[PDB]
Design a binder for this molecule. Sequence first.
Ligand code: CA
Ligand code: CA
Ligand code: CA
Ligand code: CA
Ligand code: CA
Ligand code: CA
Lengths: 213, 213
Amino acid sequence: DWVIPPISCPENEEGEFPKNLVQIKSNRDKETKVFYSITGQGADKPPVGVFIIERETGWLKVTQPLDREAIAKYILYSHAVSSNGEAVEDPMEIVITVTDQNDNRPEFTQEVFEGSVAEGAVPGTSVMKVSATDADDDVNTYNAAIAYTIVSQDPELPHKNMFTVNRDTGVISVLTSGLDRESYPTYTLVVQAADLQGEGLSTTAKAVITVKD
Amino acid sequence: DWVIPPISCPENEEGEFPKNLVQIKSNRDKETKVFYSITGQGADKPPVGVFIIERETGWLKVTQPLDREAIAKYILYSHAVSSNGEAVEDPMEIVITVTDQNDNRPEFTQEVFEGSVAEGAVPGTSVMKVSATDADDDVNTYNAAIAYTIVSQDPELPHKNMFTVNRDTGVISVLTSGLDRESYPTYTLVVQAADLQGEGLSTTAKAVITVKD
Ligand SMILES: [Ca+2]
Ligand SMILES: [Ca+2]
Ligand SMILES: [Ca+2]
Ligand SMILES: [Ca+2]
Ligand SMILES: [Ca+2]
Ligand SMILES: [Ca+2]
């Protein structure tokens, strides 16, 4: 069957407010003068006044930019009251969904990750995992699709690239041979996480790897 | 009962196109992949491509600025077809109404109106009528609500204001005494018509009045 989807409104809208969303209507507006109102969170309950309805025309409007990450869905109820003061409809549920924009940058779950690896570990050996989260919409967009990279390694010995990271999982592995605890007991890697599959907003953190016997 | 009003779109919209109007949906999109299309005048029939629908999301959009005075109402039908090629809904009627903007100036139905009046006619005597039309929406707005005025009179004798016009009807009447055929056999009046009850767009024409015995 054909059905009516929730009203959709993108977050972070700019320009002239308020903005029309949709017109609601009671077909009793034929017999009497009808006045429309809305109730619910976002209307008369917190956050108050985010949405309003024009009492005589039935035009539902949004008055401010929205934030999906604050509230992703609103449930309101419309009311219809004649000029003589009687409700001429049962209140009608109205659903509004807020659509996503890429406005949150990824964040590593810690500033410094620690791991260790045996000096004799064969190339390919998994050492540790770095992890980042992204508040944007991972279900319907790539705004939270994170790619992990290694930005730098200190020291750059015995080779510049002793390790590699899984672009999707943040698991760091031994890339080449030569780890040597006596010479270089510790490595500090700067790792990067970036959304839009690596092309978007980005953040960095450190991974400190202790070489063991 | 609560009912669904036609989609409303203001004429002469500016900025980024296309613009979203509303999202339609088949709840069979649960069982199979659904592809949406629209037919009708404004879609696949002239004017072609004014409205389109995004095949996978169901978002109906308008691609150009509209002109209420060209077309004030569109009737389209939406279709729903599975990826395997069967229609999964009966086509649904979709109505779009175009809302008015004050973009037509009034026009007198002729460039020169002619009338005559007996020189002895008492003040108040109705002489002639000027008439203007306005293509904008006279039902729902004041965009075609015309006010008539007299801009000038030639000659300005025996008095500057021998006549007056009904602001609403354009009927011109004798305002004062002194008309005298031998002295001033003819008057040329410039009359004005302006919408928004006199405050809006305006045009002028002439009224030529012959004084009779
Ligand atoms: Ca946000
Ligand atoms: Ca993001
Ligand atoms: Ca977001
Ligand atoms: Ca127009
Ligand atoms: Ca007009
Ligand atoms: Ca118009």
